[PDB]
C-alpha cells in the first residue's frame, strides 16, 4: 500500500550505481558518490566565476538538498538533522535537528535569503531564519514538494482522501498571506498504467512515485512545474482571484516527435532546470535511464509552443526525413497569434505588478503586438481568400493598429470583397472617432 517519500528538485536516483545527483537548478548541481560507509558531496555551479565549486564528506546521509545563490541546505528525512552552508566565508555553516514524531519524516525543504522552511509527511510546516531562529509551526495535509522565491512560497500536498492539492502564499513582512490554500492540482498521474513497470520507469517511481521532475518560479516570479507526462505547466492569472488558471504551455513529447522528423524517438528524455522568458533550460537525456548520467551532460534549451499540432495533417503537409516536419502557414500563424497573446498578457501582468525586472520588456511587448497583428493578418488574408466575409470581418476586429486595418482594407480590395472594404472602413471610422474622444 502507499507510502510517502522525500523529494528534492531535479535530483536523480542512483540507478545501478554508487552515485547520484541530489538537486539541480539555474545556480548549479549537487552530486554525491559512495566512499565505503561514507558519501562525498560536491556542489558544482553553472557560474563558478561568481561561485566556487566545493565538496565535503557526508556522515549523516543527507537525503534532501536545496541550492540557492547564498548557500546550500542539506537535510535528513529520518533523523531530522539539517545543515546550511553559505557559499561565502562571511557567515558560518550551522546545523539543527527538527522535532519529528515517531513515524514522521521530512518530505522536502526550501531556503531564501529571508527564510528556511521544512515540511513533513504528517503535514507539519516549520519556519526559521537563515541562522535557525524559529518563527512558527502550522498544520496542512501531507506535504510532498516545496519551492520558493524571496517571500513567495509554492507548496504541493497529497492525501488518500482529500486528493492532490497545492498552496501559494507569501511570507509578507506585515503578515503571511495565502493566495491559494490547498486548492486541487490538475497534474496527470502515471502509476495506474501497467507500462510503467518497465525497468527505467519503475526505478523512477520507486525513487519518486509522484512522477514530478521539478518545479520552480518563472523568470517573472510565476509558479511552474514539469510532471509525469513531460508537459510544462504554468499557473497563469495567479494575481487575479477569479481568473487564476493552469496553462499547458509546452509538450516536450510533441517537440521531440517533430524535431526527430515525425518519429517516435522514446530513447530521448528532457530534464528541466529553469524558465527564462519563452525558453526552458533543460538537459536532453539519451538512453534507457530517463535521468541524466555521470559526468553531467551539457545544458540545452527549448521554446514554449501552443498545442495546435496534428500529426497526420503535418505528415501530409510535409509529404533526410529526420529533419523537423513542415508546419503550414495557417498553423504557424494560429500558433503565433495564440503564443504572442499569451506572452503579451503574462508580460503585461509582470510589468503592472513586478515592473521592468530586466529593463527591456517594453521593447519585447511592442514586438509582441506587431507579431500578434501580423499573425492575424495572415489568418485574415486566408479568410478573404476563402471569400468568407464574416470570418474576415471578425478577424479584422481582433487587429489593434489602424495601420493593420489599412492593410486589411487593401487585402479586402484585392480579394474583391467591397462589402468587407465598406465594413472595415466603418470600423476604421468608428475607431478614429473613439480615438478622438
Amino acid at each position: 500500500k502507499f507510502r510517502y517519500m522525500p523529494f528534492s528538485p531535479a535530483g536523480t536516483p542512483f540507478g545501478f550505481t554508487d552515485r547520484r545527483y541530489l538537486t539541480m537548478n539555474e545556480v548549479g548541481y549537487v552530486s554525491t558518490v559512495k566512499n565505503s560507509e561514507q558519501y562525498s558531496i560536491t556542489v558544482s555551479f553553472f557560474d563558478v566565476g561568481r561561485f566556487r565549486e566545493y565538496h565535503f564528506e557526508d556522515l549523516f546521509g543527507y537525503d534532501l538538498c536545496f541550492l540557492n545563490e547564498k548557500g546550500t541546505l542539506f537535510g535528513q528525512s529520518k533523523t531530522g538533522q539539517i545543515q546550511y552552508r553559505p557559499h561565502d566565508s562571511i557567515h558560518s555553516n550551522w546545523t539543527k535537528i527538527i522535532p519529528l514524531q515517531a513515524g514522521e519524516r521530512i518530505t522536502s525543504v526550501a531556503a531564501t535569503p529571508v527564510r528556511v522552511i521544512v515540511g513533513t509527511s504528517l503535514g507539519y510546516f516549520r519556519s526559521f531564519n537563515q541562522f535557525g531562529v524559529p518563527f512558527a509551526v502550522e498544520k496542512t495535509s501531507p506535504i510532498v514538494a516545496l519551492t520558493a522565491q524571496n517571500y513567495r512560497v509554492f507548496s504541493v500536498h497529497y492525501s488518500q482522501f482529500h486528493g492532490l492539492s497545492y498552496s501559494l502564499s507569501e511570507l509578507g513582512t506585515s503578515s503571511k498571506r495565502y493566495y491559494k490554500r490547498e486548492c486541487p492540482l490538475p497534474m496527470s498521474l502515471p502509476n495506474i498504467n501497467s507500462d510503467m513497470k518497465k525497468d527505467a520507469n519503475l526505478d523512477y517511481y520507486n525513487f519518486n512515485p509522484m512522477g514530478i521532475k521539478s518545479l520552480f518560479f518563472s523568470s517573472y516570479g510565476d509558479p511552474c512545474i514539469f510532471g509525469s507526462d513531460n508537459t510544462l505547466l504554468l499557473l497563469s492569472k495567479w494575481r487575479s482571484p477569479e481568473e487564476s488558471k493552469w496553462l499547458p504551455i509546452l509538450d516536450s513529447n510533441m517537440e521531440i516527435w517533430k524535431m526527430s522528423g515525425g518519429k517516435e524517438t522514446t530513447d530521448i528524455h528532457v530534464w528541466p532546470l529553469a524558465l527564462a522568458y519563452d525558453t526552458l533550460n533543460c538537459i536532453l537525456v539519451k538512453g534507457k535511464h530517463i535521468w541524466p548520467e555521470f559526468p553531467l551532460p551539457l545544458p540545452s534549451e527549448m521554446e514554449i509552443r501552443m498545442p495546435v499540432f496534428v500529426k497526420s495533417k503535418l505528415l501530409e503537409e510535409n509529404k533526410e526525413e529526420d529533419k523537423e516536419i513542415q508546419i503550414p502557414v495557417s498553423m504557424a500563424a494560429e500558433e503565433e497569434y495564440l503564443r504572442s497573446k499569451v506572452l503579451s498578457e503574462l508580460l503585461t501582468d509582470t510589468l503592472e505588478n513586478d515592473g521592468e525586472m530586466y529593463g527591456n520588456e517594453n521593447e519585447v511587448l511592442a514586438a509582441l503586438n506587431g507579431a500578434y497583428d501580423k499573425a492575424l493578418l495572415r489568418l485574415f488574408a486566408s479568410a478573404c481568400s476563402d471569400q468568407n466575409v464574416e470570418k474576415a470581418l471578425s478577424l479584422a476586429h481582433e487587429l489593434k493598429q489602424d495601420r493593420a486595418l489599412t492593410a486589411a482594407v487593401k487585402i479586402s480590395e484585392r480579394a474583391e470583397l467591397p462589402s468587407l472594404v465598406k465594413k472595415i472602413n466603418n470600423i476604421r471610422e468608428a475607431r478614429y472617432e473613439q480615438q478622438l474622444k
Partner: peptide, 10 residues
C-alpha cells in the same frame, strides 16, 4: 497579397 503584409512590416 504578401506584399501588403510587407507594408505592415515596413
Amino acid at each position: 497579397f504578401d506584399d501588403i503584409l510587407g507594408e505592415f512590416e515596413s
